[model samples]
Target chain A: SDVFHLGLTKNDLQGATLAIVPGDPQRVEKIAKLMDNPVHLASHREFTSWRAELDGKAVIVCSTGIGGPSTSIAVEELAQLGVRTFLRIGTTGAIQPHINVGDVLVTTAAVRLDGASLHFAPMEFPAVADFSCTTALVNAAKSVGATTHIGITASSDTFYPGQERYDTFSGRVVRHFKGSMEEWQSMGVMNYEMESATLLTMCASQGLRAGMVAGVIVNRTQQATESHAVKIVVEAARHLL
Target chain B: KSDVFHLGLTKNDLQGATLAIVPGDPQRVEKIAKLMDNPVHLASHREFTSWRAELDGKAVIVCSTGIGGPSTSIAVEELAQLGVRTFLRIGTTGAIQPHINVGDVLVTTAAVRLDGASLHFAPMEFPAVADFSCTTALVNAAKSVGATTHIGITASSDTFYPGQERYDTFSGRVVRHFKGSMEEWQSMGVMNYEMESATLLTMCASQGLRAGMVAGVIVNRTQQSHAVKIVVEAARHLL
Candidate 1:
């Protein structure tokens, strides 16, 4: 019974060194082209995994839905099915100056502002990207010839108020908003994301390696092109291999 | 006969202990577990730690319920699936009312669930309420121990910071809708803000089981220790 939310058994996903977790389901086909013979594995709830190839190495592109709520379950079950490395491929917003619209992001670490990760481990347990995977991503960024920003990112539970993007019943910022961008900028937080912290924390908890490479969709300061960013992910997978 | 998924509990481990002391913090499982006479650590997985102990000479159980509804509901579901029926949620709350200060125990009669976990149990319009018997016993337990108690509604939210109007994020956004929520909850006889109580109440209520909550208050939005005394003592009378 390796199936619950994902509907995939251990036989379907076991023995894979890489599981590329994407937050959007639609992105699976887009990511599949980067693999050799990308085949749809299963679809359940917000989880949809594709078995494909990158430089002939087996790779998985599994959608983790929107936030950490589903991300935790997807990765936890995938780990049970023998996924040793979780490489999160997703989209994010640039909150820092150096990061521009459509720029690829290679996160070395994440600020665990995410509620989902806290349930896995306490705040003192840092949510850091696996050093080896992170470095390989940076090396692949060079291969793609695309501009990439390497730094810390923030993962939040709610994409709206949690990210300070203004989703209010009043349709505006609330009474006690912290206006915290000035401080995060000083702290060197470069991007606003949804799932990296939880991914890093969950993977590391079970002794697996994890990292993230995302395209900047919104700068708020962010959007539209991802063709090049996909190349970055592909090159990084190649470089990782 | 084995529970391998979430709580890591077996039917045998449940022991049909209808009375349970539920804490949101997994570490505090040991604290309340320690208070029990002849306490035995039963099983633990993730944020859940199950312990069997004797309270007032009756078999009682304690389990940690993690942060909010999703995790809390899992414990409630598993325990209900076995035989545990009554749930006493032990945790902390934020002092929203000016008159209420830190160290006061807030016993919930009702709660506004702003979390996503309980909706999977009952409709949002349904009530998230504590059992009258457990509530009375909790108040009596506090009175028996001479601890100050506040009886009112709690606003149970999923995320801690902005959901409670604490404002602990780096997103420069203003706290628009979140700003009035605190003041409104305060004006409407709501004592404080806490997570998981609404979830437990909703899950238990929908499933026809009884549940109650006892939590300490610290206005600064942190956590509690004093409430444990009320929880353990209250649990003793329930059995």
Candidate 2:
């Protein structure tokens, strides 16, 4: 018996080759609406999974809670039961001052700033997205309306200190937080969020396909906004099919 | 503003506290902290409960890293962000070596990343080893306390149940089959099974912090008091 956690067995979650992943459980159904024949599949712990058909293609939307470990566990368990593609859809913060709030980011690669994927690969190993799927997402977002930026993103464990932001930690900002942001911007990084690096790293190691499209909710330099985050991702996922 | 969300701590609470003892059990915080000269509880949030105390007149902190690597990594990451550089993991383990015996104290100079948390910090080849001086101090502390102790590599698992061979109803499905995996580790001289040390050491390595762990027979074991005293001695005089 698989015994809970994502709370599904091969029989329960199988037949879905594509999975649309978001961190928030409530967003599960919203992503489901973008597809056909959406049905709630399972809800366990922080995961509230739903299975649907996109262009008659089987797809699953599962929430990975928050953080790389949780996202990695979701991937490990799902892959064991034959999930072939994973597309992470979530929110992000615009690291560069030029990118405005509500712009879409289709991840090309990620800076593995989180602590989940390194268990699968080495540090120098790039946390890059599936080239084919990412292209499809970029094309999809362009057709979905609004500005879409395709570039490298950063994922973190903590929402607060992981990305240096407004306000302070202790009458001060964290060490290297501000400097790293400047460096990332110079390196052409687009944004910061959680879980994209995890998906990209694990997918590359497993020889699987994964891509990410995030809605910009915070501008760091600027909650500038619940989501237009969902609609654009729905378009991206739809584009993959 | 920076919110100490998971750790339940503010930066001010962690300021000036450069050294910390990371234990897997929250209740163990009070037990270990009380041994200090003037123990004071600093924060308690989720699995992280912190206390401030003075060992040998040097201020130190005892904080819970929860059970395994996910939480342990969080503790180390947040603490390191707070400017705490040294971490000593005071934990319990299930003895796997026959010569080591159940009650013998063990110190991990390094560990195998059976726990998945360390992989995110560095490559598998990156050793999840403890700090040299801190480990030497733990060994010295054990000798000073007169407890039968040995120092070697530890095996840390992500799940305590099936990973450590404590027996579970679901291992057949989740893990499928081990087929003497533990015997292989035992033959290779793995001292014991515990959680969090791999992550503690690996994150410390990634962040340039010092770390080590002292383990006893079991969780909340009868022999734990002995190991606790050894850690107290290490924190007080040696570290």
Candidate 3:
């Protein structure tokens, strides 16, 4: 069956049930190389996809663009194409004080703050990760000796006001978001990214397994070291296999 | 003058009780406290009611948080400030899964945060997971009480009607996303629907305090006494 947005088909998938999704298209090839015999498949609508083999099993590496709308589309189409398990490898801005740049975060769950997830399920539906996938990532992070924070990540719709950032183009956070950062700090939310809530929510709704690991390139509370996200997630994919 | 605005009790009145059994209805305060020793009324202000008792010779407070997250959050915040460190929310719930029957007790591990009040304390990403030690004690305690218990995640919605996908409201509409929500929740393995635990658990966990909930499901709605006994036993086990 041919998928609409991802421009892919089951023939292209080669019976792969696992996918490693990054937000940037260029990173897809970089992540795919960590697998064996990486081959580019499709490039369409901010979704660049490649296929590879992990321990003789087919694996796909795709990009989900920036936010939840595109991310949800990717999840929907990927699920349609028989990708039952997904791991999002991306970068996040650390929200809590204890986290510094270069640390990694294994998301246990996400706040349903993104609007795209709401269309799939109600706000009460928890965007929690699959326990098996989360455990695999945690083990991989430890094996790689990365500083990992295993907790919640706030997946927002926008980079600025949604994350309570005051240094946007507008230089003004709306009244609703004023004092919001301090609130997340008080609640112990670890970082901010653009996609996990939708990814986790949509996956849970469909009974598919999903997990995410993000590298901290920017720390909002303190304020980059390098993102080891690609290497860590590549290692996690092996554990899953 | 009391520093806590809503609870109507000073630190002196709290009796240094770090453990609290919080219910949503003010009237249930005495009922829960009677299970302890020397149950005594402390204060009553709006939806908030206070009572003190002794559990195994230790001071314990059984307070009412009224309904929903706003009032529940206030109750927890005020209680935490007054030396209360651990909380267990005992309440009634409506079963979302068909397997659940009237009088079945549901021990919640975590809650889906649909309440607005908790968002003020933590982002929606912050899970409303109950204190693990308290939840473990609660599961064993329910079994000891001989109540038929189901343990899993629960949904905490702010509104009892529309937010929970009830069409019995005035307009008889539960918005598009919430229209099929009950079935959706059941499929997700959510056990039941209630209103305050999201705020209770999220608020407590954020500040390093312990919290959990056990609710009696009413398919049609309690076994209130069954729930009360379970909660009491759990509190006793934890203490």
Top-TM-score candidate index: 2
**What tens-digit string does per-residue lDDT give for candidate 2 at A77-134?**
6776668788888777787888887788888988877655555566788999999788
Put down candidate 3 lDDT per residue, A1-241, tens digits, no spaces.
Answer: 3865679988999999999999877788888887799999998646889999988999999987655655756776787788889999987788788898888899999976655566456789899999889998998888878898998887775554567754322344545578877877788889877688878977787678899998888776674566566777777787787
In candidate 3, stretches whose alpha carbon ends up further than 4 angstroms from where it belongs are: A223-227, B1-239
- Poorly placed runs, candidate 2 (over 4 Å): A3-5, A24-48, A52-58, A65-69, A112-126, A155-180, A221-226, A239-241, B1-73, B76-152, B155-188, B192-196, B201-239
Winning model by DockQ: 2
True contacts kept of 2: 0.03
Q: Where is model 1 chain B poorest over a 10-residue stretch in terms of lDDT?
A: B167-176
TM-score, candidate number 1: 0.54
Per-residue lDDT of B127 in model 2: 89
Error of 2 at A109 (Å): 1.6
Per-residue lDDT of model 1, residues B157-190, tens digit only? 7554446665432231223456667878877888
Report iRMS values in order. Answer: 13.6, 7.5, 17.3
Candidate ranking under lDDT, highest first, comes to 3, 2, 1
- The predicted structure with the larger DockQ, 1 or 3, is 1
Tens digits of per-residue lDDT for model 3, B97-198: 777888888999999886555565567788889999899989988888788898899987755555677554323444586778777887899988776777
DockQ ranking, best first: 2, 1, 3
DockQ for every model, please. 0.02, 0.08, 0.01
DockQ of model 1 vs. true complex? 0.02
- Report the CA-based lDDT of candidate 1 relative to the real structure: 0.72
